[PDB]
């Protein structure tokens, strides 16, 4: 007896063909299908920041000496101080960048899951109820073709509205 | 009619502008402003700083007192402007550490 459960505090190790998807349970059995548009929408954003972190070319030629074999004093103290200042500032930039990036990546992938859920919520209208775990209880008989119509966005709520409302109340 | 429809929306413009974000090289937004000043009039405004135009004279020449720089005696400035056309016309001279003397007089 395995009941299905959604994304509320729960991932799917079994889904390998996409990043987001649907799992259903109806009269014909249980099934799973990935959602390609939302999977790629999250991937496209990660690709875009991968492109932007590498876009600048840092091309330097003749610079200053950074290693010294003899103690010299004032001028060498200054050359070392300049390079140590540059490294600490770039190290800070690198640390802050990946922190802002990862925070945003976690947010945008969490957002795609919510968008897909709300997109589904709008389709079902008064024919389903939020079970609270990331799943919908569809209050009418919904065969495989009916599940696919929800997955591909052609589900017409008026066809089943009378049946669904009678089961709800 | 027994029912009604109420839509919520936002404005749009025919031709928007491209901007960059963390993830996207170009996003079309309705409007943008430029943050990089890239143009000039070609002229130095004489206010509010006191600009002293060297004309034919370098600061070191006016310090020493080259005859055609006599007009600069006892002068003051916030910014001294040296021109390419400048030239010396007195005794040939050499200043060891010329850049340092120029810096401390100019400062």
């Amino acid at each position: 007896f395995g009941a299905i459960a959604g994304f509320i505090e729960n991932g799917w190790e079994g889904m390998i063909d996409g990043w987001y998807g649907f799992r259903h349970q109806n009269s014909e059995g249980t099934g799973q299908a990935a959602d390609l548009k939302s999977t790629q929408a999250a991937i496209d954003q990660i690709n875009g920041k991968l492109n932007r972190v590498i876009e600048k070319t840092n091309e330097k030629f003749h610079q200053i000496e950074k290693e010294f074999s003899e103690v010299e004093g004032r001028i060498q103290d200054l050359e070392k101080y300049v390079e140590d200042t540059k490294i600490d500032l770039w190290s800070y930039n690198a640390e802050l960048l990946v922190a802002l990036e990862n925070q945003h990546t976690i947010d945008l992938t969490d957002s795609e899951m919510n968008k897909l859920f709300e997109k589904t919520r709008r389709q079902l209208r008064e024919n389903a109820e939020d079970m609270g775990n990331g799943c919908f209880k569809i209050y009418h008989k919904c065969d495989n073709a009916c599940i696919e119509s929800i997955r591909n966005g052609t589900y017409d709520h008026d066809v089943y509205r009378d049946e669904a409302l009678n089961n709800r109340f | 009619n027994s029912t009604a429809t109420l839509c919520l929306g936002h404005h749009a413009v025919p031709n928007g502008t491209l901007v960059k974000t963390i993830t996207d090289d170009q996003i079309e937004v309705t409007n943008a402003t430029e943050l990089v000043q890239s143009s000039s009039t070609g002229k130095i405004c004489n206010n509010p700083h006191r600009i002293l135009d060297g004309i034919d004279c370098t600061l070191i020449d006016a310090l020493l007192g080259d005859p055609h720089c006599d007009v600069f005696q006892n002068e003051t400035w916030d910014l001294f402007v040296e021109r390419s056309k400048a030239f010396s016309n007195c005794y040939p001279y050499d200043v060891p550490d010329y850049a340092s003397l120029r810096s401390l007089v100019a400062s």
Partner: antibody, heavy 128, light 108 residues
């Protein structure tokens, strides 16, 4: 190996619509996209648009927006390009080319953001 | 649209020559610049992808360099097969834009 095979040449009247097809083999169709490039007689190359074999998403060049619609079919590994309200301006050789990897995050040097391989080309002539 | 400017538009050279053609972008495109070779009656073929990468099976004499706004394609030693038209193309932003092309012609 990896190959794109296009439909035969077409001749059309100014008001009409043309539909070019691109048949793929040698790779997973649904993991990449297809871009469309045309070349007027004695002229340079011009990009029309792109469609993903993974999602069906499309990007059209602004000047063909409204006029073009690109479709893809995973079951037959075929992408199509429809151009409407033709003109003598549209007389050109139309190419399809595999473009952009899909279904996974890719570093730039592995993004396949380049046109390869190309189809043999489809010649479209529009004249009254 | 990002404007790609190729220099020169025409070039005359002999077999065995070393030639370099230049691609310029109106704004930075990173390394998303591709090079295509087109022989007169044939479709274009990819030669260099992502600025410096030789397409598999491509001749070793072809090499590419550059980043951001400046790019170049080099042929170490010209061959009879290499007299053709060469286009650079940017893939960083949509719409994808091509250069006007460089035609390699036989010197005489």
């Amino acid at each position: 190996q990896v190959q794109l095979v296009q439909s035969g040449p077409e001749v059309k009247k100014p008001g009409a619509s043309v539909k070019v097809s691109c048949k793929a083999s040698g790779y997973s169709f649904s993991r990449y996209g297809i871009s469309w490039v045309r070349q007027a007689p004695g002229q340079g190359l011009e990009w029309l648009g792109w469609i993903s074999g993974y999602t069906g998403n499309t990007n059209y060049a602004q000047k063909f927006q409204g006029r073009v619609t690109m479709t893809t079919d995973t079951s037959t590994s075929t992408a199509s390009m429809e151009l409407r309200s033709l003109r003598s301006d549209d007389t050109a050789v139309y190419y399809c080319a595999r473009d952009k990897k899909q279904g996974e995050v890719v570093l730039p040097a592995a993004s396949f953001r380049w046109f390869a391989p190309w189809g043999q080309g489809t010649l479209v002539t529009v004249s009254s | 649209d990002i404007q790609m400017t190729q220099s020169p538009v025409s070039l005359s050279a002999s077999v065995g020559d070393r030639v370099t053609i230049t691609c310029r972008a109106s704004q930075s495109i990173g390394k998303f610049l591709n090079w295509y070779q087109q022989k007169p009656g044939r479709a274009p073929k990819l030669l260099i992808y992502y600025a410096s990468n030789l397409e598999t099976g491509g001749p070793s004499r072809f090499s590419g360099r550059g980043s951001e706004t400046e790019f170049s394609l080099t042929i170490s030693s010209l061959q009879p097969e290499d007299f053709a038209t060469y286009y650079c193309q940017q893939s960083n932003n949509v719409p994808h834009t091509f250069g006007q092309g460089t035609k390699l012609e036989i010197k005489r």
